[PDB]
Subunit: 104 residues, 3 copies
């Protein structure tokens, strides 16, 4: 019935640093603006600089958030990166102590 | 019977950098001192600097660890952050090769 | 039948920075070269510098990847770190939009 089967998901993307601006805009547009960003490096297949974007979601289908990130991060060249979806079992809002999907 | 249903959990917190000291103390007090820290930035709702604290736990209830972090990280102002709990299926101690919940 | 029960896994290692070179080589040798690296700090049991290595895998058994990392990261001294395995529910290749285990 509910998005994400009434649960919580972590959308974790590794993308090109120069695409972060467009990804932020895409996340806002899809209604899930919250995100955490980490400077990382990697290789697919000397490491290349990338950025990790993490969005924990509940109200918004994880697949919709992943699509929004992927569309904005895309260039068509090797090195564009990947998005992964992981399960999250609980969430706690530090300011209030509120827990569960409504804390996300 | 066992804490965390006899399994392993990742407690992942995104908090204010200035609260890391108190969070370290709280983690020690609750008996789960091990942690990994990452410099990150984010927004909720220009990114703001935050810190990610990760604690993989087995012997200590994940909820107790989350509460300890949340209490120490709290200020009452927007920007205090969030704690998320994710499942961990296995753990390996590099020094010994020991595996399972006892490796955590 | 398939590796990882036909699913996807995240292998997340926290190791000594000076072992990253040997870990990269070990990952290539085991046939799972892709990785993402993060500068982190931590304590087990003043934080010490460590490196986080993340490998999302499907075709290669997660346990085999963990063993490869652990062998290369090992020194025998306290501080060698840990490897954790987490479930991943989906993967998307940004360049192509391809999804599922074949996107990993
Ligand atoms: N299977 C994987 N596991 C971990 N990180 C990955 C994986 N695939 C891609 N990455 C990250 O995403 C970046 C771009 O991937 P790619 O477009 O496949 O070359 C890499 O440099 C890594 O940082
Ligand atoms: N749903 C979320 N997903 C990812 N990161 C989040 C989320 N909510 C909060 N954060 C992180 O936590 C910080 C503080 O959150 P807040 O107190 O909600 O403004 C943000 O700047 C982000 O780094
Ligand atoms: N249970 C844990 N949760 C989170 N990080 C850990 C844990 N155990 C070890 N670490 C990380 O791994 C590093 C080395 O661990 P150790 O060899 O146990 O002292 C620490 O400094 C932390 O960064």
């Amino acid at each position: 019935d509910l998005p994400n089967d009434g649960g919580i998901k972590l959308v974790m993307a590794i993308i090109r640093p120069d695409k972060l601006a467009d990804v932020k805009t895409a996340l806002a547009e899809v209604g899930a603006p919250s995100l955490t960003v980490t400077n990382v490096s990697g290789r697919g297949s000397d490491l290349h600089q990338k950025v990790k974007v993490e969005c924990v979601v509940a109200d918004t289908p994880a697949e919709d958030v992943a699509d929004a990130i992927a569309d904005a991060a895309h260039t068509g060249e090797k090195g564009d990166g990947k998005i992964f979806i992981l399960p999250v079992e609980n969430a706690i809002q530090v300011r209030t102590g509120k827990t569960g999907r409504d804390a996300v």
